[PDB]
Amino acid sequence: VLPVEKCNLEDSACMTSAFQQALPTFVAGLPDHGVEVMDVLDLDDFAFDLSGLQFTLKEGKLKGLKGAVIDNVKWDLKKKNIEVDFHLDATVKGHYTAGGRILILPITGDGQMKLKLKNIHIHLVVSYEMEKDAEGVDHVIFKKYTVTFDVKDNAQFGLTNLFNGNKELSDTMLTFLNQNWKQVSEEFGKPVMEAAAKKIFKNIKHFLAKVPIAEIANV
Numbered sequence: 232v233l234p235v236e237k238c239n240l241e242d243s244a245c246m247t248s249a250f251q252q253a254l255p256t257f258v259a260g261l262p263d264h265g266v267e268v269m270d271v272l273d274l275d276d277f278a279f280d281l282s283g284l285q286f287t288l289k290e291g292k293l294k295g296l297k298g299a300v301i302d303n304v305k306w307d308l309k310k311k312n313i314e315v316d317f318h319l320d321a322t323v324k325g326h327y328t329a330g331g332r333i334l335i336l337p338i339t340g341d342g343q344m345k346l347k348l349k350n351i352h353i354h355l356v357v358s359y360e361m362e363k364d365a366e367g368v369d370h371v372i373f374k375k376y377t378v379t380f381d382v383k384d385n386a387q388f389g390l391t392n393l394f395n396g397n398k399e400l401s402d403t404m405l406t407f408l409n410q411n412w413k414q415v416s417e418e419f420g421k422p423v424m425e426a427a428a429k430k431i432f433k434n435i436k437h438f439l440a441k442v443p444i445a446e447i448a449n450v
């Protein structure tokens with residue numbers, strides 16, 4: 232199904248390489264297997280209300296996951312956790328709305344978004360159980376995850392139709408977001424990441440649940 236060389240789980244050099252070879256095929260999607268495309272990833276509609284900003288995103292897209300570099304995969308067979316560190320550049324797009332304020336500036340907006348995130352580092356931890364199925368085939372079954380993020384290099388904000396078309400105000404806001412990009416990544420990044428992470432997690436869990444572990448590991 233997926234092109235992956237078989238590792239011992241505690242050989243982290245190997246696992247980091249296997250994840251790296253699998254990832255692009257995987258994120259392309261596996262229609263017949265019930266695995267959605269994850270680059271470009273369709274994010275489900277969401278909203279958030281945080282630190283004075285009422286935000287929504289519709290027709291959400293996350294681009295970039297097909298080019299992620301896996302930094303390390305640490306498998307702890309004792310605790311039955313997997314730690315996966317990786318980084319990428321990502322673009323988040325869609326029909327956004329904004330009201331309230333961002334930090335010290337009031338905002339209104341109803342238009343299109345293009346967020347370009349450069350060298351975002353992600354720290355994923357998954358909990359899993361090994362589970363034999365009804366016909367006796369052992370599977371890795373994902374149970375929970377945590378994900379943290381750190382945008383190290385830069386984040387760029389493209390927001391159309393801010394301030395009902397007023398250039399002056401839109402220009403001031405856009406300059407403002409790019410100058411304080413880090414702060415803004417830390418204030419509002421979590422709900423965005425979570426929109427992607429829950430969908431990505433669903434599909435990995437679905438996939439691993441159905442593919443025998445012996446097909447993708449030395450167990």
Ligand SMILES: COC1=C(OC)C(=O)C(C/C=C(\C)CC/C=C(\C)CC/C=C(\C)CC/C=C(\C)CC/C=C(\C)CC/C=C(\C)CC/C=C(\C)CCC=C(C)C)=C(C)C1=O
Pocket residue numbers: 233235238246249250251253254257286293296315317321323327329333338344346348351353355371378380382386390415416417419420421423424427428431432435439447448
């Ligand atoms: C070795 O055997 C194998 C396994 O073990 C058995 C495997 O598990 C697997 C797994 C299969 C593959 C390796 C695929 C693995 C997949 C992996 C590691 C991907 C995991 C991805 C995670 C679940 C989620 C990642 C999430 C992201 C990239 C999203 C990040 C986005 C972020 C942080 C957005 C940040 C946003 C901001 C900074 C600004 C936000 C602000 C605003 C929107 C508001 C702006 C202000 C207003 C005005 C608009 C394989 C292949 C295998 O072979």
